Symmetry: D2
Subunit: 450 residues, 4 copies
């Protein structure tokens, strides 16, 4: 498949191990190929009865799948990861066509997807409860919840579908997944791959739709749980200037800047401000924008036209608020004529920024960098600590004392020093998709208090 | 202290390490000594501004307490458990006066309380994150959430206050605790004991009140999290009749039957029904009802008069629905004249019960046992499986095959065989009162995708 | 490949990713096809200089392999298990030819082998140290030991090689494996598979030899660690008689009884002695003896002629010690003429045994069952309590109390109820093949005592 | 109690909860007060029959202690730590009299001792096995080994006795402890405290003696396990010079330098050699030498006269090998006349050292520092890479990259950055003092291969 030719030719819901048209409607939405602006699908948003059919069908698959063993569930999930690995370029292509991120980034998304699949497969084989000890004992066993729902986002369509379904299925649950109406295509490749690996029909069902479809899923009595889905970058004078510039571009211009907790609030010390800016703008203007399916493309189009307009409005407002545009912030017309109707824009860098500007305190969700100058550590510590734990943060400095000091002081939950799985994350994520059943076995006689 | 003399003489809120009157009112409630019906306190339910003072004061204590080390937090919590242990009889007495459970049961409640305190003290000293490994590494650290709220119940006043505060404080959080308006007294002994062990002023604050006070706590922007707070018993013919009768009494008549997930739906096979019933009624009529502070008392009064009336209404309705009363189910007037105004009643046993009866499908929260006869395992499996996971269950049989078969088939989350801490519970409970902060330390150079 | 045709055609040592002849000699041994008595290989036992070549070559691979990430180690180990699975019938065939166990049992051994490979592959990806918190922190990291040595046995050649190398390589170690001189062939398929999966040359080397070779391995200064490699069955009257008979045969006659911790000391209550014995002898004489490569063979030949004589000698001694032979205990002459020189014997059952008999206090390591009668639970508890923790044990009873009670009193470490991976086993095994490096990072100033 | 008056007045073996004279002799040794040279005890080294009495008596306590619950074991161990805390000054005093370390350091040792006691007390309450799930399940349980043996050293007498007995007793083992014949006194305060906390008589027994006694302990068949008991400091120019000097003194002159893995091999860059050395010698000559029981003493006497001579002999050899003495390395004559026969020496600093010098490649186990100059990071990396994993190491640098990079390349197992419990250490130590008993519970029928 190449850019500018694909159209969806099959239904976009998935039930009983096959693609089906929604039995019920709650809206009608268009899916786009953002590189060209073409309509690749006009699909039906699922209604109440379609949601019920998917949840009932998933309840029937949960009964079979949960009664399987942890070793058998691991075997199938490893097979699914193998199929995702064998078909990575095909999946990344579909991911690019619908989402518009570069094939370079899409390949990484799928790598993370099947690595996550293998990870929770491993935990499903080695899953174990507790045994606690007058010769009597009790034991605990983790049990799946039943039918779970995963609500996807459009910036990482295939990856989020993988990261929500992998742990849920590993614990023995079924999942009804609702992709973002922007990106409905790639989620069915995963549903088809799960079925090819040997999951029962209905274990991973796909229902398309928007808010109404998502509301029906959350309200369903047979649904057990539902999984749903600014960050400052600080660069000191004692940092590795090269690593700070490279890290700055990696924090603002990956996936067209449409990433949660992006380092869009960049703090640079006055001592090394001109050197940083000059090197950032030069390397930013060298980023090749174009067809996502090209191996050298590092920035494709934005997700859709209304989002591109909302990003441009942020740049315009910043300009009228006193900010200076050094590059980008406007429509980009690529040489390729087949992309002429795509939603492209040049990555934007803004200088002369202030804390009162709206382009500093609002998530733009676009390729827009905000550079704010500061004098000393004291000033910059109190300007970027209004970030909540859910946000990320990053610091650049060649000092084991100064680094951890700022990372401790900051309230952000995911911090970075000089850049931007384990067991806990798996255990915590498995706990979200399971419940602990206790059993107390009295071997002797009962001691009555009466 | 003895029964029939205590009255509260000090304020019932706790702030800044001292008992204070609520700065704000949202109601006025009476606390009773249920053994005598006396009013031991008329206290003010906390209003919005009192809740705010308590949460602000707790926020100031969290800042000091969280900056302390896990070893220091463990030291103080162990000291608190020692003080609870040294003063167990004084605390159990206050617990009895206000709640009405026997001093026998109250002592067990406090044992569980300081054992829980020592447990989470231990986990606070040994708490640790993860270290994951091109020479670069990341680490995780558990951090307290801030100001937590614990909402107590009236059946286990001191124990719930301990089980909510122990893990919260162990992780470095502060807690504003709201006791049940029925049982406000004992929670301040814990707050006084925490302060005597060395917690900062405000770490464990107590605000009295009902729904309005609890709503103010949940709505407060500086509150990080809020902790809030029928089961079938199956007896087969191949069981130990003695252990099944003893287990049946222990599942219905502990804490006057005012326990969640009590085994009030008791299934007995037809083969051993008369033998079970005759032995149950004889031992039930031998339970001594009276002053909770007596060492031989096994059943005190119910929590308050409106609850006693609601329990009696359940017995009356069952009688008019065809159930047979074999003992109890009515007011009990003890010999002691000082208890003559207490809320006493004889424990009730009901035979000739049916699945359509309301006293079988509704939680009575009183000392009422419902015995239902069944022929075979098949019948009894499909009659008691309408219980949700949150409910408990119990089976009595001398068969390693038949026991686990019924415990597996049942959906109840906490099951018992022939009766009625570990690491997981602590880890899971600590996760509820904390968040995982990640740090990525890049030692080398940044690899730009561009 | 069929029975009676295979001869080794390639060298049987493995170094630098290829089969090599040992540069040094310490003996010359013959490997047999026990189904026919044929010599399938005459190989050179490795000397000191060959051992040094393998250990030096393994040290060079450890330097490369350890610098890989846990995700890369997992990826390669998952491929290795897939290749073992794709070639399971070829590996099981070679296993049968050299070892003589049934193709039915060999297939199970290799299933366990690649499942173990996937198991530790999973742990290699999720391996993590600890992060412990005056504002300073320390972290730990598990590190491979270096060059480890695995010493194999002849009863499970391919499985032991898999169970020793999988965890060692998963932690980042290299391994020089020394198969049993009886069964040298199958270990090289694993070495060939490891190299085909992508391990560096020298990561898994194979040196053949006996005690002298093993001494050179254990004495080598660059070797970090070395991994090296009677059980009672109690049957009560309340058991499932059929399951006790089937379990008894599965505890004595699997792998020609050449298994450690086999349930060869069988205690039977007097009430069900004749019924049990008659049914055991009936089913024992129905065990098909013959060519291991036949799908209906359930017992092949013993490992070699000197071992068959040693087992037969145990039967003869038992007869003159008072034991009664009900079946087997003698040579089995198959119809097939290619097997006429194989080391076959019929499975043996012995009654009227005593604890002072030599066939009761010594591990026969052959297909010989010893039936001992007992009166009560007390007697059999005091007759079987001379068992060490390292041995296994089994009980057959329909009593949740009597089972766990007898299993508790017994000293055996591995017990079975009514028959004969998790996370702990992996962690403990990983700890054997790794060491904990701690790092203390001082963020503040040093507190000098002086 | 003050220095120069104490003599032992009671027997120094401990059996059955009381001090006993050894029934058997294997030698007669003198214990000294190194501050004065006085003989505080002339005790009998235990023979074979005394060792047997202690091990048999310990086996009887293991039978009682192991049958206790983890909560009861925790309760008693928490009391033991409290008693150690209540008597810390008395224990530290006895520790000083016999060992000679400063009361300042002894107090820290005992803090670590009861903190360790509380640590494993916590793990004893929360100890749990595993529960692994064809509808059948298995469980594991950690069980004590039986009678364990702890062999103490003289540099940390009370701490080693605490760190060996705490985990052993927490897992349910008994322990027969053999102190170093140099320092036999303090180990009996712990035995007296254990008995006062409520351990059964014989759970912690103490047998005095040397190698012969230790051989009898290791050879005893009823003994289950036995627990038994140069490091470079690298200083770069970009470090906090003051913190590097303070850290250097803390790495050489704590406990009279009689510590394993002391940072005695000090590498200093040429750029900051004179400034570092001059500041180290200045602060070293300010270390107060004298009576260990004085609060301002930071260095007491060496352990005994033969050890002082062995340290002084190392200094003399270094001088004739080319080393330069800047301070210390000779006898220290205190003003106090009661200390005139003590084993004192001034702390020594050596410059102009080489790697071929004997005082650089041998552990002196005395207060002697070796300063080595180096040009670049590469040189010092290749000069200090002969260190074994068991040794410690330390680096001083203000570089998050250079620190972890040098700590990674180094082979030392315990590293320090800019200086010199968690869950893992406890679990691993508990695994040393326990074994895993597995149980497989078959719920269904047995699948016979025959
Ligand atoms: O883009 P977005 O940031 O709004 O993400 C919202 C996701 O959930 C869905 N959504 C929006 N409102 C919802 C609601 N009220 N309930 C359930 N899902 C909802 C959307 O379709 C989308 O998949
Ligand atoms: O007896 P109950 O079973 O109603 O327990 C409810 C507990 O929370 C409080 N409560 C009742 N309604 C509440 C609400 N809407 N919000 C917060 N707390 C509430 C009560 O005071 C009590 O402590
Ligand atoms: O049943 P077995 O004794 O035949 O198995 C013992 C295994 O260790 C090896 N072995 C025997 N003696 C040895 C020694 N002294 N040193 C090292 N390995 C030895 C053997 O090769 C064999 O693989
Ligand atoms: O520094 P060190 O050698 O003095 O410490 C060694 C410790 O083990 C003991 N020891 C010495 N030789 C021993 C042996 N052969 N067996 C058992 N213990 C021995 C000593 O008593 C001492 O407590």
């Amino acid at each position: 498949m190449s850019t500018g030719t694909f159209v969806v030719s099959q239904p976009l819901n998935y039930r009983g191990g096959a693609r089906v048209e929604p039995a019920d409607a709650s809206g009608t939405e268009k899916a786009f190929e953002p590189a060209t602006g073409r309509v690749i699908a006009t699909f039906t948003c699922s209604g109440e009865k379609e949601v019920n059919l998917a949840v009932q069908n998933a309840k029937a698959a949960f009964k079979i799948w949960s009664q399987k063993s942890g070793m058998e569930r691991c075997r199938i999930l490893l097979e699914a990861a193998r199929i995702i690995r064998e078909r990575e370029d095909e999946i990344a292509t579909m991911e690019c066509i619908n989402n518009g991120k570069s094939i370079f980034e899409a390949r990484l998304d799928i790598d993370i997807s099947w690595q996550c699949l293998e990870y929770y497969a491993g935990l499903a084989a080695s899953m174990a409860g507790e045994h606690i000890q007058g010769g009597s004992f009790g034991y605990t066993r983790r049990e799946p919840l039943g039918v779970c729902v995963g609500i996807g986002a459009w910036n990482y369509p295939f990856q989020i579908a993988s990261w929500k379904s992998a742990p849920a299925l590993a614990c023995g649950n079924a999942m009804v997944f609702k992709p973002s109406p922007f990106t409905p295509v790639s989620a069915l490749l995963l549903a088809e791959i799960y079925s090819e690996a040997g999951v029962p029909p209905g274990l991973f069902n796909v229902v398309q739709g928007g808010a109404a479809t998502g509301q029906f899923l959350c309200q369903h009595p047979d649904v057990a749980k539902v999984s749903f889905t600014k960050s400052p970058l600080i660069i000191f004078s004692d940092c590795d200037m090269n690593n700070a510039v490279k890290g700055a571009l990696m924090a603002n211009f990956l996936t067209q800047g449409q990433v949660c907790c992006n380092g869009t609030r960049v703090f640079v010390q006055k001592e090394i401000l001109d050197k940083f800016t000059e090197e950032v703008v030069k390397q930013t203007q060298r980023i090749k924008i174009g067809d996502p399916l090209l191996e050298d493309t590092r920035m494709g189009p934005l997700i859709n036209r209304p989002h591109l307009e909302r990003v441009l409005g942020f740049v315009k407002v910043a300009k009228e608020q006193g900010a200076k545009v050094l590059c980008g912030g406007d429509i980009y017309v690529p040489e390729d004529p087949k992309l002429k109707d795509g939603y492209y824009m040049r990555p934007c860098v803004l200088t002369n920024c202030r804390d009162d500007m709206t382009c500093v305190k609002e998530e733009i969700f676009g390729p827009v960098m905000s550079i704010l100058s500061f004098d000393t550590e004291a000033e910059v510590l109190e300007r970027a600590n209004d970030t909540t734990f859910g946000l990320a943060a990053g610091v650049f400095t060649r000092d084991i004392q100064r680094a951890h000091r700022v990372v401790a002081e900051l309230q952000a939950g995911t911090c970075f020093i000089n850049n931007y799985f384990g067991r806990e994350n798996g255990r915590v994520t498995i706990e979200y998709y399971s419940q602990l059943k206790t059993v107390c076995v009295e071997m002797g006689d009962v001691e009555s208090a009466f």
